[PDB]
Amino acid sequence: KVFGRCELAAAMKRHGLDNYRGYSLGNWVCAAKFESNFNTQATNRNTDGSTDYGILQINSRWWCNDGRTPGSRNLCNIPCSALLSSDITASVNCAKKIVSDGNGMNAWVAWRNRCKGTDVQAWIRGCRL
Ligand SMILES: [Cl-]
Ligand code: NA
Incomplete structure (x- = not known):
């Protein structure tokens, strides 16, 4: 499923990420944009042989x-394929564990390089939340 920006913002809010x-909602929306282009089916192979899955590219x-x-x-006790569902529940729950690990959203390289220190509120502008 390719989410709309505001659709994904609404789903992430409902699932407790705001x-x-x-981390404000805009951080999560910005991260998803640059990780997956808001596509739940996104997969990408890492150099070490691991793969990143889903809307937040979980490794x-x-x-x-x-x-x-x-x-x-x-550590999320799930098959990686669960992270490709049209329903983002598994992605969100695993993301909560990740961001709690000690490094916060620095765990997401696209967040650190493209979202951190920017006006991330722009990502939810216009959205009925
Ligand atoms: Cl943090
Ligand atoms: Na694994």
Whole structure:
């Protein structure tokens, strides 16, 4: 599913991400934009052999099981394919664990390089939330 910007903002708000660990909604929308282009089916292979899955590009090195990432963890206790659903519940719940790990949203390289320090409120401008 390719979400609209405001549609995804509404879903992320409903699932409790607005100001989760102090990150406003705009941070999450900005992150999804530059990770996945708001596409739940997005997958990308990392150099280390792991893969990133879904709207927030969650990595099989640590968070999910995709059956092909040796010596990795599954800290969200889910198959990576759950992260490609039209329903973002699994992505959001796993994201909450990630952002709680100690590094906050720096875990998402696209967030650190493209969203951090910017006017992220722009990502939810116009949206009925
Ligand atoms: Cl933090
Ligand atoms: Na894994």
